Amino acid sequence: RAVNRNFLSSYTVNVPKASQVALADKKARILKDVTFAGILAGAILDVDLKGTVAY
Amino acid sequence: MQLETAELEKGLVRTLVDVIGHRLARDKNNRPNVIRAYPSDNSNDKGLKPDQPFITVYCQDAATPYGWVLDKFVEDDVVCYRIAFQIPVLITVNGKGAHSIMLELKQRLEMSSVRDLILEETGATVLDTGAIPNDYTYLNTDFENSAPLVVTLVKNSVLKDERGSIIERVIVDGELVYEEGQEPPEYTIHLDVDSK
């Protein structure tokens, strides 16, 4: 959804395996170690220009 | 019912007196001559050979070709077992016209009747009936005509196991764990169930 706004331009997600979670998390019914990443788009606000004139 | 060949032979002897008694000789008491093989009494007395024609009944052996145990059940608090048995029997006619008498005896054991009387007395079913040879044995002086026959029977025997016992109460314990070998269990369930 964020990528659709032209805010980001990519991302990645990582999640743990069920056979790897600790016992305390299972007793507390909470999932941890989920992470992700993204990249920004950018914009334009200023311009620099140079030219010449001759015969 | 328990299986005992001593009773099967007696039942067959009692049945044959009525089934084929009209063709046989008769003793001083007017009874047809049908006897068990190797007659003896009081551990050394030996019977005499009756007047011909007569019949001899001899049980060969007993086997269990049908598995080893048929049923195991509880009848009253005492445990019980049922076992299937097979018993080949040998019947011989001695005299003159032995074959002519064995043929008619064969033709009567196959009737719907007679097979009911056998089951009434011995409590066993006729399974098979083999062929009849026509034998001659010299003895002394003159030959003797004989005609053996084999009739197989089937019977179920039941015995009581006086050493057995029944379960009437069960005690059960259990545990629950998130992970294998969780030393303090999450929960413990204790149950007890009586027959009453």
From TrEMBL, chain A:
This is Structural protein. It comes from Escherichia phage JohannRWettstein. The chain holds residues 395 to 449 of 450 of the full protein.
UniProtKB/TrEMBL annotation, chain B:
InterPro entries: Gp12-like (IPR057087). It comes from the Viruses. Residues 42-175 form the Phage neck terminator protein gp12-like domain. This is Phage neck terminator protein gp12-like domain-containing protein. Pfam families: Phage_tail_terminator_9 (PF23961). It comes from Escherichia phage JohannRWettstein.
